Amino acid sequence: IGTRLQEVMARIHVATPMDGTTRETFIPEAVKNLKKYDKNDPNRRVLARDIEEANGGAGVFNVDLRKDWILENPEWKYDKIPEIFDGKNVYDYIDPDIDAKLQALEEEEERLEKEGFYDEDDEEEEEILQKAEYIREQHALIRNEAKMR
Amino acid sequence: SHRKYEAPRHGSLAFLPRKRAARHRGRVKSFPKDDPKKPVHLTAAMGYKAGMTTIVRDLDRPGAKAHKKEVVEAVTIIDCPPMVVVGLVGYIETPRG
C-alpha cells in the first residue's frame, strides 16, 4: 500500500471504543422543540444583527453587556460596582462569609481590649538625660573648636 | 540640476514667522459665527494651566479595538476660578471691517 493510499485509509478509518460502550449525552429538552431560523419567515426571531441594523449599523450601535446578567435582584443590573477604596481592592475583600469573619474579628478585638492589649503606660531619669544632652552639646562645641584650630 | 531623491520640506510655512508672540495672553482671532435663532451664550473663558495627570477611562467607542475596555490617558488640569463681567463692547460693520 502506497503512502497516499495509506493516508486515505487513515482518513476513512473510524476508531471505536473496544468495550462497545457509549458516553451519556446532554442535549437539553428544548432543542427538539426549537423552530429552525428562516430569513424569509415574517415571524422569525429578531436577532442582534437586526437590532444593530435598526440602531445605526455596525460601528455605531453600542451593545449593552449587562442586559443578560442574571442577578438576585434585577434592579442591580446597571449599578456602578466599586473597585477601589482607600488604596485597597474591593474585589480582594469580597467574601461570601464576610459577616461571620467580621464578627469573629470584633469578638477578638473586645477580648484583647479586656485583656489590656491596647493599654498604654521619672524626674530623676529626665534630669540625667538632660545632663547627658548638655554634655553631648559641650563635646560637640569642643570638637568644633578643634576643627577650627 | 534636479534633486536626486525627493523629500518634503522641513517645517510648515503656515506658521511663519517663528518670532516671539506680541502678547503673553492668547488672542481669540475668530469667534464662532453668530446665529440669532440660538439663545444668548458666552463663547469663551479663561483659566490657568496647573499641570497634568493620568486617568483610567472606561471606553465606549464602537468599532475600536479598545471598545468596552479600560484605557489609560494623559490629561491636563486647568484651574478655573470664576470670571467677573465688568464691561460691554459694541461693534459695527464697515467697509474696512
Place this chain on the structure above:
Amino acid sequence: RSLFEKPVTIDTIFEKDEMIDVIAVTKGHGFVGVTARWGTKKLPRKTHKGLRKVACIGAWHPSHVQWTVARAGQMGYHHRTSVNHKIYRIGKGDDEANASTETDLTKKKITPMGGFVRYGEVNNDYVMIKGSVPGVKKRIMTLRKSLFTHTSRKALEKVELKWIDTSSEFGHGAFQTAAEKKQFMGTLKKDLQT
C-alpha cells in the same frame, strides 16, 4: 448689562464631554539652531565649521537667501490655537471629592500629593482636558467654543472615568493619599517621638 459685576463659573460656559479649542503662547526656548528649530539632519562628525547646520543655504539663483531656508533663531513662545480637545470633567472647587469616581470611592481632591510641581494646589473649579495644550504651568489659557459643528464620533462620546491619579509628581509617587502612605509605611520613629 444683567451680567455686570457678576461672577460667571466655568460650567455655565462649558460642559463635560464638549470639545473645545485652547489658545495660548507656547513654551519658550530662546535662540535655537536649525537642528532643533526645524528638524534638519545633522552633518557628519567633525564637519568643518560645524555640523548642527544646513550645508547649502543656497546653491542656485537668486543671489539671495530665500525665506524658505531654515535659519537659527527664536524657538517657542509662539501663539497657538489647538482644536478639538475633549473635556473629561468639570470639577467643582467646593467638592471635597472632585477627583473621586463611581468605582473609586476614595474621597480626594484633584491636587497631587505634595502639590502640583511649580504651581501649588487647585482649590477652585477646574477643567480636565484630554491630552496636552500649548501652554506651560502658571500660564493663562483661553478656552473657546469650537467654530464649527463637529463631524466625529469622539465629540459625541460621553466620558466615563474610573480613576484619577493623585500621586506625587515630584518623583515616583506610589500613594494616592497621605493616609494610604501611612498605612503602607507603618509606624515611624518620629511617631513615637511625638
Place this chain on the structure above:
Amino acid sequence: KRGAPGGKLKMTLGLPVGAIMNCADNSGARNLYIIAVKGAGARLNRLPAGGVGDMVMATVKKGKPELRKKVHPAVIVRQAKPWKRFDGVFLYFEDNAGVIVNPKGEMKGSAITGPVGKEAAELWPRIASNAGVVM
C-alpha cells in the same frame, strides 16, 4: 493582499532592517535576519522597522541548509524594546523572536517555543492556535 495586518495600534518598533532575531518555531531555522518590513512607508535615510505583530521578510543565517537560500515571511512575536499597550502598561520580553509564515499567515512550523505577544496572537489566528503562553 500584502503582509501588513489591519487594526493594529501604534507601538514602539524595536527591530530595524539588519536585526537578527531568534526563531521561536520548530521549522529548522535558528535565527532570522530582517531585510524588509511589510507596510513600511517612504522616508529619506529612515531604516524600515517592525514591532511585535508585524510581518517582515527575513533570511535564515543559522539553521537547516534548505532554508538558507530563500526569503521567508515572518511574524515578530517577541521584542526586547519596551513598548506601551493601551492599558498604560509598558512592557518588554527578554529576547527578539519571530516565526516563519506564508503570506496568508499560516505557519511553516508546527510548534512555538516560549510565549508570544498579545498583538501577534490577536492579529494572526494560526499563531494564536499554536501558542502555549500569551503574554
Place this chain on the structure above:
Amino acid sequence: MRIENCFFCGRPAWPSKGITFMRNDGKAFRFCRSKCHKNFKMKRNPRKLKWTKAYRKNAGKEMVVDSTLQFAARRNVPVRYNRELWQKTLKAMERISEIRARRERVFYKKRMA
C-alpha cells in the same frame, strides 16, 4: 482596574506606573519604578536590600501573623454581584483598616520597648 504590587519592593503599583518584564518561561515581573527595575536587572536580592518589604518581612519588622491580614486575597472563584454584599464589604474594609492600624502601632511599640 486594580492596584498591583511591586515584585521587588512591594509598594502599590497603580496603573501606568513602572514596567513589566516578560520572561520566556512564562512569568511576568511588575516593577513600580525604574529603581526596582534596575536593581532587578543588576540581579540584586530584594531580601538583602533593607528598603524593601521583603527584607522587612525577613527581618521580622512587619506584622506577619495577625487576624486582620486574612481578609485580603486574590479571589480565583468569582462571586455573583450583590449590592448589599458590596456595601457591607466596603464597611468591613474601613473597620479592618482601623483595627490593623491599632495593632500595628502596638507591634511597633513592642519592638521599641
Place this chain on the structure above:
Amino acid sequence: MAVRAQFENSNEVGVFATLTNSYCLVALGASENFYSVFEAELQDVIPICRTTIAGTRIIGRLTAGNRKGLLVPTTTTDQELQHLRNSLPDDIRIQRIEERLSALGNVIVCNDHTALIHPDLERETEEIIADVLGVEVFRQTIADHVLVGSYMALSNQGGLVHPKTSIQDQDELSSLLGVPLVAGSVNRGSNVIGGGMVVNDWLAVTGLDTTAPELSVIESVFRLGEGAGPGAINTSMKNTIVESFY
C-alpha cells in the same frame, strides 16, 4: 446541524468562540454577525456571553470548559471574571487558574466526561481541572502535538483529530476517551481542528472554507442532524472521501 460561519472574514471559529453543552462564549467584535450566527442556532436554550479575556479577542484559545465548569487563565481581570460570573447561571463553576501555560483552550480539550491535557501542565492545575470540570484527566498528545485543544475537537458523541493521526493512535485514544474518533480536516485542508471549529452535543460551527466532504465527515462523527452516524464514513461516504482526499 453543522453551520459555516466567519468571525470578521476569518475561518478560525474556534479561535474566537467556546461552545459547551450549557453555555457559549463569543468574542466581542465590531458587529453582531458572529454573535447572531450562534443566536440563530441556539435560540436562548443556552446563554451566549460576549466576553473578553486578558484584553484579547482570542477567547476560544484562552478559555476551556464543559457543561459543568469554566477555566480562565491568570491574566483575566476581575471585571471580566465578574462579567462571566454574572452571565452564567450558578450551576456552572468558574475558576481562574494560575497555570504557566495560559492558553487553556490550546492545552486542554474536554467533553463532559474526560479531558486531555498538555503533558507539562502542573499537578495542581490537573487537580483543579478534575475538580471544576468533574472529569477524568489524561496527559496525551495528538499526532505528536502537545496542543491537544487546538489539534482536536471533542464532544460526548465523538471526536475529530489531526488528519495525520495514525490508526493505532486513533484506536488507543478512542478506547481512552470512550467516544468514536475520526481523523479529518477543516477549512480546506487545515489540520488545526480546535482552532477551526467548535462543537457540542447538538451543534457544530465550522469555518466558511470548510468543504462539503469534510462537513459531511464532521456531521457523521458528531451525529449532527437526522440519521447521522460515524458508520456512514466507511460505508456511505467512503467513495466521496477517497475521491476528495486522495
Place this chain on the structure above:
Amino acid sequence: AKSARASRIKENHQRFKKNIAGPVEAARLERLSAKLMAIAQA
C-alpha cells in the same frame, strides 16, 4: 484617498452636522444658556 477638501467629503460632513451632531449641540446649548440666564437674572 479623497482629500479633506473633497466635495463628497464636505457633503458627507454636512449631512453628519445636520442630522447627528446638530441636535446634541443644540440641547447642550439650551442647558448652558439656561444656567447662565439664571445667573444673569439672579
Place this chain on the structure above:
Amino acid sequence: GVFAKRTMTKTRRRLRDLDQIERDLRSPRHLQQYKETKAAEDLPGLGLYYCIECAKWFESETSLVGHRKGKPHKRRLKQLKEGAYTHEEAMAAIGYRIDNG
C-alpha cells in the same frame, strides 16, 4: 573582571536567573527545555561539561572542576542555600495570599 562592563545591563547581555536555576536543580525537565533552546554544536565542549548552579558551559572536565574551586561558584552555592526570591516570597512579604476556594 567583566567583559565589556559598559553594556552589561543590556537585555541582549542577560544571564539566567537564580529562580530558574533553582527550578533547573529541582526538575530535570525544566533544564531539558532550557538546553533544548540551545544548539549543542555551538556550545563549549559540545555541551558535555555544564554547571547548573552557574548556568555555564565549559570546554573540558578539568576546566569545570577547576571552576568549582573558585569564589563565583561558591557565591552561587551560598545564594542557592539562602534561596531565590520568588513571587510567593513577594506575596508573603506584603501578607497577600491566593484564594482558590
